[PDB]
Write a protein that binds this ligand. Structure first.
Ligand SMILES: *C/C=C(C)/C=C/C1=C(C)CCCC1(C)C
Length: 137
């Protein structure tokens, strides 16, 4: 039950479809699904506190959060939001998001550490669920 690691993605499903629901430019949608754009994910967890760094070819972003305390981040398409993470079970957390301005699809994400050492991420926009799977490196 410690999410800490350097995680490499091995499986993705429905990501392009998620970006389409979010209104992302098709130009970026095709780029985003390219093997080149795969995100490296670094997580450091201590207690209820999480540090997560995501890196791609030209972008690196960091978020810090504590379970139960509201924080600000961005939706997958980059719109600022307020987020609140809570546990669903011993090994899975769930985050609900609220836009800071304007309106758009209802977005959320989950992270789950399996008993076989994989990290499963889901990201949802309205009715579309994208699922990603990572392993430690
Ligand atoms: C599965 C998630 C991605 C491929 C994300 C890609 C990505 C970032 C993580 C940062 C913004 C650029 C973009 C390539 C969309």
């Amino acid at each position: 039950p410690n999410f800490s690691g350097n995680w490499k993605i091995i499986r993705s499903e429905n990501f392009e479809e998620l970006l389409k629901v979010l209104g992302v430019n098709v130009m970026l949608r095709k780029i985003a699904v390219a093997a080149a754009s795969k995100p490296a994910v670094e997580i450091k967890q201590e207690g209820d506190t999480f540090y997560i760094k995501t890196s791609t070819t030209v972008w690196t972003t960091e978020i810090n959060f504590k379970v139960g305390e509201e924080f600000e981040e961005q939706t997958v398409d980059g719109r600022p939001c307020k987020s609140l993470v809570k546990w669903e079970s011993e090994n899975k957390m769930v985050c609900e998001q609220k836009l800071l301005k304007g309106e758009g699809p209802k977005t959320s994400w989950t992270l789950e550490l399996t008993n076989d050492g994989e990290l499963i991420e889901t990201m949802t926009a309205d009715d579309v669920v994208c699922t990603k799977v990572y392993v430690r490196e």
